[PDB]
Amino acid sequence: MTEYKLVVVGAVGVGKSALTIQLIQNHFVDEYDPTIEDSYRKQVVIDGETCLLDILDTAGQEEYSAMRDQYMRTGEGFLCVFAINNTKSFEDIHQYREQIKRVKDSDDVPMVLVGNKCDLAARTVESRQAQDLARSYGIPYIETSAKTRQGVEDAFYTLVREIRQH
Ligand SMILES: Nc1nc2c(ncn2[C@@H]2O[C@H](COP(=O)(O)OP(=O)(O)NP(=O)(O)O)[C@@H](O)[C@H]2O)c(=O)[nH]1
Ligand SMILES: [Mg+2]
């Protein structure tokens, strides 16, 4: 096995836990809506390689977390999540990427920009705008819905591939 340390970041309510839980769930527990940041594990085969993903579901910058800095030092790749119906969450992406750069002292950290809640008609962030932003960062952009499952595996596996290609 190869182990990957993934960190999910983004503003309050964008769907960080929903995404993480949807990926990692074994469905013994019907509904699980975590109230606190936590770490989860998932074994998956990605391109023939058996991967152990450790996924940290972080709190928004709005919440205090003592270990936030070490989380970013330990993290190998980051999913930067905003919601396509939440313009402020999109604008906040800059702050998450700056935090990661300040802590890791690097311009070249593996990351994927994730526009969540793509099941919703009430869109305020157009796909093209997010593609531009991801292009400016030199990272992939993937739209997801934790509710419909669209894009969820793709977002996480793309991040693993970014770590690999680093
Ligand atoms: N329509 C829709 N709602 C979603 C989606 N993902 C999450 N939600 C909803 O958005 C809300 C916030 O989700 P949650 O998973 O708690 O987000 P979070 O980013 O972990 N929040 P927090 O920062 O407070 O931990 C919940 O009501 C959840 O059901 C999605 O893809 N589509
Ligand atoms: Mg959460």
Swiss-Prot record:
<dbReference type="GO" id="GO:0005886">
    <property type="term" value="C:plasma membrane"/>
</dbReference>
<dbReference type="GO" id="GO:0006897">
    <property type="term" value="P:endocytosis"/>
</dbReference>
<dbReference type="GO" id="GO:0008285">
    <property type="term" value="P:negative regulation of cell population proliferation"/>
</dbReference>
<comment type="subunit">
    <text>In its GTP-bound form interacts with PLCE1. Interacts with TBC1D10C. Interacts with RGL3. Interacts with HSPD1. Found in a complex with at least BRAF, HRAS, MAP2K1, MAPK3 and RGS14. Interacts (active GTP-bound form) with RGS14 (via RBD 1 domain). Forms a signaling complex with RASGRP1 and DGKZ. Interacts with RASSF5. Interacts with PDE6D. Interacts with IKZF3. Interacts with RACK1. Interacts with PIK3CG; the interaction is required for membrane recruitment and beta-gamma G protein dimer-dependent activation of the PI3K gamma complex PIK3CG:PIK3R6. Interacts with RAPGEF2.</text>
</comment>
<dbReference type="GO" id="GO:0008284">
    <property type="term" value="P:positive regulation of cell population proliferation"/>
</dbReference>
<dbReference type="GO" id="GO:0042088">
    <property type="term" value="P:T-helper 1 type immune response"/>
</dbReference>
<keyword id="KW-0333">Golgi apparatus</keyword>
<dbReference type="InterPro" id="IPR005225">
    <property type="entry name" value="Small_GTP-bd"/>
</dbReference>
<dbReference type="GO" id="GO:0048169">
    <property type="term" value="P:regulation of long-term neuronal synaptic plasticity"/>
</dbReference>
<dbReference type="InterPro" id="IPR001806">
    <property type="entry name" value="Small_GTPase"/>
</dbReference>
<comment type="function">
    <text>Involved in the activation of Ras protein signal transduction. Ras proteins bind GDP/GTP and possess intrinsic GTPase activity.</text>
</comment>
<keyword id="KW-0702">S-nitrosylation</keyword>
<dbReference type="GO" id="GO:0043495">
    <property type="term" value="F:protein-membrane adaptor activity"/>
</dbReference>
<dbReference type="GO" id="GO:0090398">
    <property type="term" value="P:cellular senescence"/>
</dbReference>
<dbReference type="GO" id="GO:0005789">
    <property type="term" value="C:endoplasmic reticulum membrane"/>
</dbReference>
<feature type="modified residue" description="N-acetylmethionine; in GTPase HRas; alternate">
    <location>
        <position position="1"/>
    </location>
</feature>
<dbReference type="GO" id="GO:0009887">
    <property type="term" value="P:animal organ morphogenesis"/>
</dbReference>
<dbReference type="GO" id="GO:0036064">
    <property type="term" value="C:ciliary basal body"/>
</dbReference>
<dbReference type="GO" id="GO:0000139">
    <property type="term" value="C:Golgi membrane"/>
</dbReference>
<keyword id="KW-0378">Hydrolase</keyword>
<dbReference type="GO" id="GO:0090303">
    <property type="term" value="P:positive regulation of wound healing"/>
</dbReference>
<dbReference type="GO" id="GO:0006935">
    <property type="term" value="P:chemotaxis"/>
</dbReference>
<dbReference type="GO" id="GO:0090314">
    <property type="term" value="P:positive regulation of protein targeting to membrane"/>
</dbReference>
<feature type="glycosylation site" description="(Microbial infection) O-linked (Glc) threonine; by P.sordellii toxin TcsL">
    <location>
        <position position="35"/>
    </location>
</feature>
<dbReference type="GO" id="GO:0097193">
    <property type="term" value="P:intrinsic apoptotic signaling pathway"/>
</dbReference>
<dbReference type="GO" id="GO:1900029">
    <property type="term" value="P:positive regulation of ruffle assembly"/>
</dbReference>
<keyword id="KW-0488">Methylation</keyword>
<keyword id="KW-0963">Cytoplasm</keyword>
<dbReference type="GO" id="GO:0005654">
    <property type="term" value="C:nucleoplasm"/>
</dbReference>
<feature type="binding site">
    <location>
        <begin position="116"/>
        <end position="119"/>
    </location>
    <ligand>
        <name>GTP</name>
    </ligand>
</feature>
<dbReference type="GO" id="GO:0007165">
    <property type="term" value="P:signal transduction"/>
</dbReference>
<dbReference type="GO" id="GO:0042552">
    <property type="term" value="P:myelination"/>
</dbReference>
<dbReference type="GO" id="GO:0051726">
    <property type="term" value="P:regulation of cell cycle"/>
</dbReference>
<keyword id="KW-0449">Lipoprotein</keyword>
<dbReference type="InterPro" id="IPR027417">
    <property type="entry name" value="P-loop_NTPase"/>
</dbReference>
<dbReference type="GO" id="GO:0098978">
    <property type="term" value="C:glutamatergic synapse"/>
</dbReference>
<dbReference type="GO" id="GO:0003924">
    <property type="term" value="F:GTPase activity"/>
</dbReference>
<comment type="similarity">
    <text>Belongs to the small GTPase superfamily. Ras family.</text>
</comment>
<keyword id="KW-0539">Nucleus</keyword>
<dbReference type="GO" id="GO:0042127">
    <property type="term" value="P:regulation of cell population proliferation"/>
</dbReference>
<keyword id="KW-0225">Disease variant</keyword>
<dbReference type="GO" id="GO:0010629">
    <property type="term" value="P:negative regulation of gene expression"/>
</dbReference>
